[PDB]
Amino acid sequence: RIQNPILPGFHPDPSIVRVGDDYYIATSTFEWFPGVRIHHSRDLKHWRFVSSPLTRTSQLDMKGNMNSGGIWAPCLSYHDGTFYLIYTDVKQWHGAFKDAHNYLVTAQNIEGPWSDPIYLNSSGFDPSLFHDDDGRKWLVNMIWDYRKGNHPFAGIILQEYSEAEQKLVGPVKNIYKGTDIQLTEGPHLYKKDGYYYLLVAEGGTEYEHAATLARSQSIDGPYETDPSYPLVTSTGQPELALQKAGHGSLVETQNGEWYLAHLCGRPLKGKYCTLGRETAIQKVNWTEDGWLRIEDGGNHPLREVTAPDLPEHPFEKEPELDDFDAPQLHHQWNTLRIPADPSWCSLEERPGHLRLRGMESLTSVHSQSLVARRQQSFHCEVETKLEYQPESFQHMAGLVIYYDTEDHVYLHVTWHEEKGKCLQIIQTKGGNYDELLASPIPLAEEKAVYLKGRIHRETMHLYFKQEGEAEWQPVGPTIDVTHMSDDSAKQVRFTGTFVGMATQDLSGTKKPADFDYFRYKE
C-alpha cells in the first residue's frame, strides 16, 4: 500500500518520530534555507510538509557555506512535551578535515516557535540525542579522524547531555566501531526488551550505502552487531528501483508495528540521481533472536510496502500554481543560504507579484536573489510570467533549473547592445560557463515574457512566448539534465535539482524583476 519514495525529491537522512497519533520525519537541507524540513503523517502512507525549524540567522548562518555544506543529517526527537532538534552546520567537508558544529533547538509545537541554538560539540557529524528511561539524556555522533594512515570514520562516540546546564558533560566514550562495510555514521539509540540498540549507517551515502543494527546490555557497550548485517542495502543490485538504501531511523506504531525510514536514490542513465536522495520507508519485523529484518525476509528496500493498521488519512493536494497573492512565501519555496529579505525579495511592494531585486551571479555562494523549490518527479512542467526591463548585459532575470554553482540551466531575459531586450539560455556544466543560443532572441520592450520548461527524466526542453502571442515557441536545444545530480561531479554531492526564479544585477543597481506567478505541475 505504501508507495516509495514517500518523500520524493531532495529529502535525505530521514529522522522519524511518533508523538501520539502523529508521525514526523525531518530531513537534511544543506545549503538551502530554511533549514531542516519536517513532514507529517497519520498513516505512514500520506505525507505533508509541516515546518522548517531553522528560519533565523541566529539559528542558522550559512552565508558563504560551500556547496553541500550546511545542514547535514538532523535528528528530531520528542520527550515530555518538548520537541528536540539536533542539527549540524558544516563549514568545510572537502579534504582531510571536517569542520562541523552541532546544535540543539527546542519547541513545544512541531511548527510552534523554535528556540535559538545551544552549542553541543564538533567532533563529528550525524549527532543524535537519546532520552533514556532514567531521565538522563545522551548524545551520540560519529568521530572524524583526519590523520594520514587512519580510516576517517573512527566510530561512534557517546557523551551525556545535561539539560540543566545546557551542555555536554562527563567522559566521552567510543562505543562502536562499525563493520567491514565501514564509513560508519548516522548513529541512533533505541531501547527495547532490555537491550540498547544502536542503528548506524555504513558504506557511504552512495551505491554501497547500508543500515546495520547492533545491540548491547549497556549504553556504552560493547556492542554486538547483527550477524545477518546489514539490515538494509542496495549495493550489488542494479535491478532495485531504490538504490543507496541506508541512513535510516526506526519508529514503532501504536500497534507495535515497526518501520524503517531511510534514504535512497533513483538513478537515470545508470547512475545519475537528478532528484537527489529521497525518503522511503520499510516495514521491519523483530526476529526470534532479537534482530530486525525487512518484511519479506530480505535485505533490500521494497518499492511498495505493507501499510500499518491505521485509519487512512490523506491530505489536500498542494496547488499547481502560486499566484503570489499571499504576503508570505509558500512553504515550498527556499532560498540559497540566507533568509529572504524585503530588500531583495518582496511580496508587498507589488501585491500579487514576487518582486526580486538582482544581486550576485549564479556562481556565488554568498548572496543570490534566487527562489526555488524541489523537483519531486522525473516528469514535470515549470512556468512563470516575468516583467523585467534590463538596461545592460549585467541585468538578467528568468527561469532557473538549479543544482549548484557548478551545474544549472537558466532561461533569462537580458539586454544586448544591438538587440535591446532579449532572451538567452545560460548553462553551466561542471563549472564551465556556456550560452546555448548563438545569438539572443530579441524581445518586445513593452511586453511581459512567459518562460516554460518541461522535464522528462534525462532530458528537458525550454519554451517561451510574449504577451499577445497565442502559441508557445520552443527555444534552445533539448537539454540533458543529468549533469544536475548527486553523481555527476568529481566528488559526491548531497542535494538535488531545484526549479525556480532568479535575477541578478551585476551592475549593483538592485534592478527589480517581477514574477507574476509560478506553476509546477507533475
Coordinates of C-alpha atoms in Angstrom, one line a residue:
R1 CA 0.0 0.0 0.0
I2 CA 2.7 2.5 0.9
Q3 CA 4.5 3.6 -2.3
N4 CA 8.1 4.6 -2.1
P5 CA 9.7 7.0 -2.1
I6 CA 7.3 8.6 0.5
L7 CA 9.2 11.9 0.3
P8 CA 10.2 12.2 -3.4
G9 CA 12.9 14.7 -4.4
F10 CA 15.6 16.1 -2.2
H11 CA 14.8 14.6 1.2
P12 CA 17.9 12.8 2.7
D13 CA 18.7 11.4 6.1
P14 CA 15.2 10.8 7.4
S15 CA 14.8 11.1 11.2
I16 CA 11.3 9.7 12.1
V17 CA 9.5 10.0 15.4
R18 CA 6.0 9.3 16.7
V19 CA 4.2 11.6 19.1
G20 CA 0.9 10.0 20.0
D21 CA -1.0 9.5 16.7
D22 CA 1.2 11.9 14.7
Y23 CA 4.3 10.9 12.8
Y24 CA 7.1 13.3 11.7
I25 CA 10.2 13.0 9.5
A26 CA 13.0 15.5 9.5
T27 CA 15.4 15.6 6.5
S28 CA 18.7 17.3 5.8
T29 CA 18.7 20.6 3.8
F30 CA 22.4 21.5 3.3
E31 CA 22.8 25.0 1.8
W32 CA 19.0 25.5 1.2
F33 CA 17.2 27.9 3.5
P34 CA 15.2 27.5 5.8
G35 CA 17.0 24.6 7.5
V36 CA 15.7 21.1 8.2
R37 CA 12.5 20.0 6.5
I38 CA 9.7 18.3 8.5
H39 CA 6.9 16.3 7.1
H40 CA 3.9 14.8 8.9
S41 CA 1.7 11.7 8.5
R42 CA -1.0 9.9 10.4
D43 CA -1.0 6.6 8.5
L44 CA 2.6 6.5 7.1
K45 CA 1.1 6.4 3.6
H46 CA 0.2 10.0 3.1
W47 CA 2.6 12.8 3.9
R48 CA 2.5 16.6 4.1
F49 CA 5.0 19.4 4.8
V50 CA 4.5 20.8 8.3
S51 CA 7.5 23.0 9.0
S52 CA 11.1 24.1 8.7
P53 CA 12.6 24.9 12.2
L54 CA 15.6 27.0 11.3
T55 CA 14.3 30.3 9.9
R56 CA 16.6 32.8 11.7
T57 CA 20.2 33.6 11.1
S58 CA 20.6 33.4 14.9
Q59 CA 19.8 29.7 14.4
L60 CA 21.5 29.2 11.1
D61 CA 24.0 31.4 9.4
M62 CA 25.1 29.8 6.1
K63 CA 26.3 32.8 4.0
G64 CA 29.5 31.7 2.4
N65 CA 29.0 27.9 3.0
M66 CA 30.4 25.8 0.2
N67 CA 28.0 23.7 -1.8
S68 CA 26.7 20.6 0.1
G69 CA 27.9 22.1 3.3
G70 CA 25.4 23.5 5.8
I71 CA 22.7 21.2 7.3
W72 CA 23.7 17.6 7.2
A73 CA 21.8 14.7 8.8
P74 CA 19.4 16.0 11.5
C75 CA 17.7 14.3 14.5
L76 CA 14.2 15.1 15.6
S77 CA 13.1 13.6 18.9
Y78 CA 10.3 14.2 21.5
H79 CA 10.2 13.9 25.3
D80 CA 7.9 15.1 28.0
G81 CA 6.1 17.7 25.9
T82 CA 9.1 19.1 24.1
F83 CA 10.5 18.5 20.6
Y84 CA 14.3 18.3 20.4
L85 CA 16.1 19.1 17.1
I86 CA 19.8 18.3 16.8
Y87 CA 21.5 19.7 13.7
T88 CA 24.8 20.3 12.1
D89 CA 26.2 23.3 10.3
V90 CA 29.1 22.0 8.1
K91 CA 31.7 24.7 7.2
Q92 CA 34.3 22.5 5.5
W93 CA 34.0 19.0 4.2
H94 CA 36.3 18.5 1.3
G95 CA 39.8 17.4 2.1
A96 CA 41.2 15.6 5.1
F97 CA 39.2 17.6 7.7
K98 CA 35.5 18.0 8.7
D99 CA 34.6 21.3 10.3
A100 CA 31.1 20.8 11.5
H101 CA 29.3 22.2 14.5
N102 CA 26.4 20.5 16.2
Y103 CA 23.5 22.4 17.8
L104 CA 20.2 21.8 19.6
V105 CA 17.0 23.8 19.4
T106 CA 13.6 23.1 21.1
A107 CA 9.9 23.7 20.6
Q108 CA 6.6 22.7 22.3
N109 CA 4.9 22.5 18.9
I110 CA 6.3 21.0 15.7
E111 CA 5.6 24.2 13.9
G112 CA 5.5 26.3 17.1
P113 CA 8.3 28.8 17.7
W114 CA 11.7 27.2 17.8
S115 CA 14.4 28.4 20.2
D116 CA 17.8 29.8 19.4
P117 CA 20.6 27.1 19.5
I118 CA 22.6 25.5 22.3
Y119 CA 26.0 24.5 21.0
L120 CA 27.0 20.9 21.6
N121 CA 30.3 19.7 20.1
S122 CA 32.2 19.5 16.8
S123 CA 34.0 16.1 17.0
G124 CA 32.0 14.7 14.1
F125 CA 28.7 14.9 12.2
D126 CA 25.4 12.9 12.4
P127 CA 24.6 13.9 16.0
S128 CA 21.7 12.2 17.7
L129 CA 20.0 12.8 21.1
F130 CA 18.8 9.8 23.1
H131 CA 16.3 10.1 26.0
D132 CA 16.8 7.1 28.4
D133 CA 14.0 5.9 30.7
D134 CA 16.0 7.0 33.7
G135 CA 15.6 10.7 32.8
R136 CA 19.2 11.0 31.5
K137 CA 19.9 12.2 28.0
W138 CA 22.8 11.2 25.8
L139 CA 24.3 12.4 22.6
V140 CA 26.0 10.1 20.0
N141 CA 27.7 11.2 16.8
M142 CA 30.5 9.8 14.6
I143 CA 34.0 10.9 15.3
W144 CA 36.2 12.1 12.4
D145 CA 39.9 11.2 12.3
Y146 CA 41.8 13.3 9.8
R147 CA 45.2 11.6 10.4
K148 CA 47.2 10.3 7.5
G149 CA 47.1 6.5 7.9
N150 CA 43.7 6.0 9.5
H151 CA 40.2 5.4 8.3
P152 CA 38.4 8.8 8.9
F153 CA 35.2 7.2 10.2
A154 CA 36.7 6.3 13.6
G155 CA 33.5 5.1 15.1
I156 CA 30.5 6.2 17.3
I157 CA 31.1 8.4 20.3
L158 CA 28.9 8.8 23.4
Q159 CA 28.6 11.7 25.9
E160 CA 25.9 12.7 28.3
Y161 CA 23.9 15.8 27.8
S162 CA 22.8 18.0 30.7
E163 CA 19.6 19.8 30.0
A164 CA 20.1 21.6 33.3
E165 CA 23.5 23.1 32.3
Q166 CA 22.6 23.0 28.6
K167 CA 25.9 21.4 27.6
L168 CA 27.6 18.0 27.2
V169 CA 29.1 16.7 30.5
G170 CA 31.2 13.9 31.7
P171 CA 33.5 11.5 29.9
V172 CA 33.3 10.7 26.2
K173 CA 33.5 7.1 25.1
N174 CA 33.8 5.4 21.7
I175 CA 31.1 2.7 21.9
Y176 CA 31.1 1.1 18.4
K177 CA 33.5 0.9 15.5
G178 CA 31.1 -0.5 12.9
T179 CA 31.6 -3.3 10.5
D180 CA 33.7 -4.1 7.4
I181 CA 31.3 -2.1 5.4
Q182 CA 33.0 0.9 7.1
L183 CA 32.2 4.6 6.8
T184 CA 30.2 4.1 9.9
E185 CA 27.9 7.1 10.7
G186 CA 24.3 8.1 11.4
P187 CA 24.1 6.6 14.9
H188 CA 20.7 6.2 16.6
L189 CA 20.0 4.7 20.0
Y190 CA 16.8 2.8 20.8
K191 CA 15.9 0.8 24.0
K192 CA 13.9 -2.4 23.6
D193 CA 13.4 -5.5 25.6
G194 CA 16.4 -4.9 27.9
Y195 CA 18.8 -4.0 25.1
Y196 CA 20.3 -0.8 23.9
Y197 CA 20.0 -1.0 20.1
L198 CA 22.4 1.1 18.0
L199 CA 21.4 1.7 14.4
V200 CA 24.1 3.0 12.2
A201 CA 24.6 4.0 8.5
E202 CA 27.6 2.4 6.6
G203 CA 29.3 2.2 3.2
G204 CA 28.9 5.9 2.3
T205 CA 25.7 7.5 1.1
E206 CA 26.3 6.3 -2.5
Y207 CA 25.7 2.9 -4.1
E208 CA 27.3 0.9 -1.3
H209 CA 25.1 2.6 1.3
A210 CA 23.6 0.4 4.1
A211 CA 22.0 0.4 7.5
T212 CA 23.3 -2.0 10.2
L213 CA 21.9 -2.8 13.6
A214 CA 23.9 -3.6 16.8
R215 CA 23.0 -4.1 20.4
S216 CA 24.3 -4.2 24.0
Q217 CA 23.0 -4.6 27.5
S218 CA 24.8 -1.3 28.5
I219 CA 24.5 2.1 26.7
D220 CA 28.3 2.3 26.5
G221 CA 28.8 -1.1 25.0
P222 CA 30.4 -3.3 24.0
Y223 CA 28.0 -3.6 21.1
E224 CA 27.4 -6.8 19.2
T225 CA 26.5 -6.5 15.5
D226 CA 23.6 -8.4 13.9
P227 CA 25.2 -11.5 12.4
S228 CA 23.0 -11.0 9.4
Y229 CA 24.0 -7.4 8.8
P230 CA 23.2 -5.2 7.0
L231 CA 19.6 -4.6 7.8
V232 CA 19.0 -2.8 4.5
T233 CA 21.2 -2.1 1.4
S234 CA 21.0 -1.9 -2.4
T235 CA 24.8 -2.5 -3.0
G236 CA 25.3 -5.0 -5.8
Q237 CA 21.7 -4.9 -7.1
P238 CA 21.2 -2.6 -10.1
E239 CA 17.7 -4.1 -10.6
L240 CA 16.4 -2.4 -7.5
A241 CA 14.2 0.6 -8.1
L242 CA 15.5 2.0 -4.9
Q243 CA 19.3 2.3 -4.7
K244 CA 21.6 3.7 -2.0
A245 CA 19.3 2.3 0.8
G246 CA 20.8 3.5 4.1
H247 CA 20.9 6.0 6.9
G248 CA 17.6 5.1 8.5
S249 CA 15.8 5.7 11.8
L250 CA 13.2 3.4 13.5
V251 CA 9.7 4.0 14.7
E252 CA 7.1 1.8 16.5
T253 CA 3.4 2.4 15.8
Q254 CA 0.6 2.3 18.3
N255 CA 0.0 -1.4 17.4
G256 CA 3.6 -2.4 18.0
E257 CA 4.5 -2.4 14.3
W258 CA 8.0 -1.3 13.3
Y259 CA 9.1 0.8 10.3
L260 CA 12.4 1.9 9.0
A261 CA 12.6 5.3 7.3
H262 CA 15.7 5.5 5.1
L263 CA 17.1 7.5 2.2
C264 CA 17.5 6.1 -1.3
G265 CA 18.3 7.2 -4.9
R266 CA 16.6 6.6 -8.3
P267 CA 19.4 7.0 -10.9
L268 CA 18.9 7.9 -14.5
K269 CA 21.2 6.6 -17.2
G270 CA 22.6 4.1 -14.8
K271 CA 23.8 6.4 -12.0
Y272 CA 22.5 10.0 -12.2
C273 CA 20.1 11.0 -9.4
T274 CA 18.7 14.2 -10.6
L275 CA 16.2 14.1 -7.8
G276 CA 18.9 13.7 -5.2
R277 CA 18.4 11.4 -2.2
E278 CA 14.8 10.7 -1.3
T279 CA 13.0 9.2 1.7
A280 CA 11.5 5.7 1.6
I281 CA 10.1 3.5 4.4
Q282 CA 10.1 -0.2 5.0
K283 CA 8.2 -2.4 7.4
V284 CA 10.5 -4.3 9.6
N285 CA 9.8 -7.3 11.9
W286 CA 11.7 -8.4 15.0
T287 CA 13.2 -11.9 14.8
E288 CA 13.0 -14.7 17.3
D289 CA 16.6 -13.9 18.2
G290 CA 16.1 -10.2 18.8
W291 CA 17.1 -8.5 15.5
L292 CA 15.2 -6.7 12.7
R293 CA 14.5 -7.7 9.2
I294 CA 12.7 -6.3 6.2
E295 CA 9.1 -7.7 6.0
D296 CA 9.8 -10.0 3.1
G297 CA 12.7 -11.7 4.9
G298 CA 15.2 -10.0 2.6
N299 CA 17.9 -7.3 3.0
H300 CA 16.7 -4.9 0.3
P301 CA 14.4 -2.0 0.1
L302 CA 10.9 -2.6 -1.3
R303 CA 9.2 -0.1 -3.6
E304 CA 5.8 -1.0 -2.3
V305 CA 5.4 -1.6 1.4
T306 CA 2.6 -3.0 3.6
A307 CA 0.9 -0.1 5.4
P308 CA 0.3 0.0 9.2
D309 CA -3.1 -0.9 10.6
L310 CA -4.3 2.7 11.0
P311 CA -7.2 4.7 9.5
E312 CA -6.3 6.2 6.2
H313 CA -5.6 9.9 6.5
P314 CA -4.9 11.6 3.1
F315 CA -4.2 15.4 2.8
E316 CA -5.4 18.1 0.5
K317 CA -3.2 18.3 -2.6
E318 CA -0.9 21.3 -2.9
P319 CA -1.9 23.8 -5.6
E320 CA -0.2 23.6 -9.0
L321 CA 0.0 27.4 -9.3
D322 CA 1.4 30.1 -7.0
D323 CA -0.1 33.5 -7.9
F324 CA 1.9 35.2 -5.2
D325 CA -1.1 36.8 -3.6
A326 CA -0.2 35.9 0.0
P327 CA 2.1 38.2 2.0
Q328 CA 4.3 35.2 3.0
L329 CA 6.1 32.9 0.6
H330 CA 4.5 29.5 0.1
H331 CA 6.3 26.8 2.2
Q332 CA 7.7 25.0 -0.9
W333 CA 10.0 28.0 -1.7
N334 CA 13.6 28.0 -0.5
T335 CA 16.5 30.5 -0.9
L336 CA 20.2 29.8 -1.0
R337 CA 22.0 30.0 2.3
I338 CA 20.4 33.3 3.5
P339 CA 16.8 34.1 4.5
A340 CA 14.7 36.1 2.0
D341 CA 14.8 39.7 3.0
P342 CA 12.4 42.6 1.9
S343 CA 15.4 44.4 0.4
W344 CA 15.6 41.8 -2.4
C345 CA 12.6 39.6 -2.1
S346 CA 9.2 41.2 -1.6
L347 CA 5.6 40.2 -1.9
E348 CA 4.3 43.5 -0.6
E349 CA 6.0 46.1 -2.8
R350 CA 3.7 45.0 -5.7
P351 CA 0.9 42.8 -4.4
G352 CA 0.1 39.7 -6.5
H353 CA 3.7 39.6 -7.7
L354 CA 7.0 38.3 -6.3
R355 CA 9.5 41.1 -6.7
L356 CA 13.1 40.1 -6.7
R357 CA 15.9 42.6 -6.8
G358 CA 19.1 41.5 -8.6
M359 CA 22.2 40.6 -6.6
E360 CA 25.1 38.2 -7.3
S361 CA 25.7 35.7 -10.1
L362 CA 24.5 32.1 -10.1
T363 CA 28.1 31.1 -9.2
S364 CA 28.1 32.9 -5.9
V365 CA 28.0 31.2 -2.5
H366 CA 27.0 34.4 -0.7
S367 CA 24.0 36.4 -1.8
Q368 CA 21.9 35.3 -4.7
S369 CA 18.4 36.6 -5.5
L370 CA 17.1 33.1 -6.2
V371 CA 13.9 31.5 -5.0
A372 CA 13.2 27.8 -5.9
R373 CA 11.5 24.6 -4.9
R374 CA 12.4 20.9 -5.1
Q375 CA 11.8 19.0 -8.3
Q376 CA 9.9 15.9 -7.0
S377 CA 9.1 13.9 -10.1
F378 CA 11.0 12.9 -13.2
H379 CA 8.2 14.2 -15.3
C380 CA 7.2 17.8 -14.7
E381 CA 6.4 21.2 -16.2
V382 CA 7.5 24.6 -14.9
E383 CA 6.3 28.0 -16.0
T384 CA 6.5 31.6 -14.9
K385 CA 5.5 35.1 -16.3
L386 CA 8.1 37.8 -16.0
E387 CA 8.2 41.6 -16.3
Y388 CA 11.8 42.9 -16.5
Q389 CA 13.3 46.0 -18.0
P390 CA 17.1 45.2 -18.5
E391 CA 19.3 48.1 -19.5
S392 CA 22.7 46.3 -19.6
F393 CA 24.1 42.8 -20.2
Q394 CA 24.7 42.9 -16.5
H395 CA 21.0 42.6 -16.0
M396 CA 19.4 39.1 -16.1
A397 CA 16.1 37.6 -14.8
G398 CA 14.3 34.4 -15.6
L399 CA 13.6 30.7 -15.1
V400 CA 16.2 28.5 -13.4
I401 CA 16.8 24.8 -13.1
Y402 CA 19.5 24.7 -10.4
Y403 CA 21.6 22.1 -8.7
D404 CA 24.5 24.3 -7.5
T405 CA 27.0 26.9 -8.7
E406 CA 28.7 24.4 -11.0
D407 CA 25.6 22.9 -12.6
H408 CA 22.5 24.9 -13.7
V409 CA 20.3 25.9 -16.6
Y410 CA 19.0 29.5 -16.9
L411 CA 16.4 30.7 -19.4
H412 CA 16.6 34.5 -19.0
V413 CA 15.7 38.0 -20.2
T414 CA 18.6 40.4 -20.6
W415 CA 19.8 43.3 -22.7
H416 CA 22.1 43.3 -25.8
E417 CA 23.8 46.3 -27.3
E418 CA 22.3 45.5 -30.7
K419 CA 19.1 43.7 -30.0
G420 CA 18.0 45.6 -26.9
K421 CA 15.7 43.4 -24.7
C422 CA 16.4 39.8 -25.5
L423 CA 16.3 36.1 -24.4
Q424 CA 19.2 33.8 -23.8
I425 CA 20.0 30.5 -22.2
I426 CA 22.9 30.1 -19.9
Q427 CA 24.1 26.6 -18.9
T428 CA 26.9 25.9 -16.5
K429 CA 28.1 22.3 -16.6
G430 CA 31.0 21.1 -14.4
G431 CA 31.7 24.7 -13.6
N432 CA 32.0 25.6 -17.3
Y433 CA 30.0 28.6 -18.4
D434 CA 28.2 28.4 -21.7
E435 CA 25.4 30.0 -23.7
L436 CA 23.1 27.7 -25.7
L437 CA 21.9 30.3 -28.2
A438 CA 24.4 31.6 -30.8
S439 CA 22.6 34.9 -30.5
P440 CA 20.0 36.1 -28.1
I441 CA 16.4 36.4 -29.4
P442 CA 15.1 39.9 -29.4
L443 CA 12.0 40.6 -27.2
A444 CA 9.4 43.3 -27.4
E445 CA 10.3 46.1 -24.9
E446 CA 6.8 46.6 -23.5
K447 CA 5.6 43.0 -23.2
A448 CA 5.7 40.5 -20.3
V449 CA 7.6 37.3 -21.1
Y450 CA 6.4 33.7 -20.5
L451 CA 9.1 31.2 -19.7
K452 CA 8.5 27.4 -19.6
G453 CA 10.4 24.2 -19.0
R454 CA 9.3 20.6 -19.5
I455 CA 11.4 17.8 -18.0
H456 CA 11.1 14.1 -18.8
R457 CA 13.8 12.0 -16.9
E458 CA 17.2 12.6 -18.6
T459 CA 16.1 15.4 -20.9
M460 CA 14.2 18.7 -20.9
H461 CA 13.2 21.4 -23.4
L462 CA 12.6 25.1 -22.9
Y463 CA 9.8 27.3 -24.4
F464 CA 8.7 30.9 -24.3
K465 CA 6.2 33.4 -25.7
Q466 CA 5.3 37.1 -25.2
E467 CA 2.0 38.6 -24.0
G468 CA -0.1 39.0 -27.1
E469 CA 1.1 35.7 -28.5
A470 CA -1.2 32.7 -28.8
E471 CA 1.4 29.9 -29.2
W472 CA 4.4 28.8 -27.2
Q473 CA 7.7 28.7 -29.1
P474 CA 10.5 26.2 -28.4
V475 CA 13.9 27.7 -27.5
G476 CA 17.3 26.2 -27.4
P477 CA 18.1 22.5 -28.0
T478 CA 16.9 19.5 -26.0
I479 CA 19.0 19.5 -22.8
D480 CA 20.4 16.5 -20.9
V481 CA 19.8 17.4 -17.3
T482 CA 21.8 14.5 -15.7
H483 CA 24.7 16.9 -15.1
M484 CA 22.5 18.4 -12.4
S485 CA 22.6 15.4 -10.0
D486 CA 24.4 13.9 -6.9
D487 CA 26.6 11.7 -9.0
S488 CA 28.0 13.8 -11.9
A489 CA 30.7 15.8 -10.2
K490 CA 34.3 14.8 -9.1
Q491 CA 33.0 14.2 -5.6
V492 CA 29.6 13.2 -4.3
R493 CA 27.0 16.0 -3.8
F494 CA 24.2 15.9 -1.3
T495 CA 21.2 18.0 -2.6
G496 CA 19.1 17.6 -5.7
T497 CA 17.6 19.6 -8.6
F498 CA 15.6 22.7 -7.8
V499 CA 13.4 24.7 -10.1
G500 CA 12.5 28.4 -9.7
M501 CA 13.1 32.1 -10.3
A502 CA 16.2 34.2 -10.2
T503 CA 17.6 37.5 -11.2
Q504 CA 21.0 39.2 -10.9
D505 CA 22.1 42.8 -11.3
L506 CA 25.8 42.6 -11.7
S507 CA 26.0 46.4 -12.0
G508 CA 24.8 46.7 -8.4
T509 CA 21.7 48.7 -9.0
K510 CA 19.3 46.2 -7.5
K511 CA 17.1 46.2 -10.6
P512 CA 13.7 44.6 -9.8
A513 CA 12.2 41.7 -11.6
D514 CA 8.5 40.9 -11.1
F515 CA 7.3 37.4 -11.4
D516 CA 3.5 37.3 -11.8
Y517 CA 3.2 33.6 -10.9
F518 CA 5.0 30.3 -11.0
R519 CA 3.5 26.9 -11.9
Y520 CA 4.9 23.5 -11.0
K521 CA 3.0 20.5 -12.4
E522 CA 4.0 16.9 -12.4

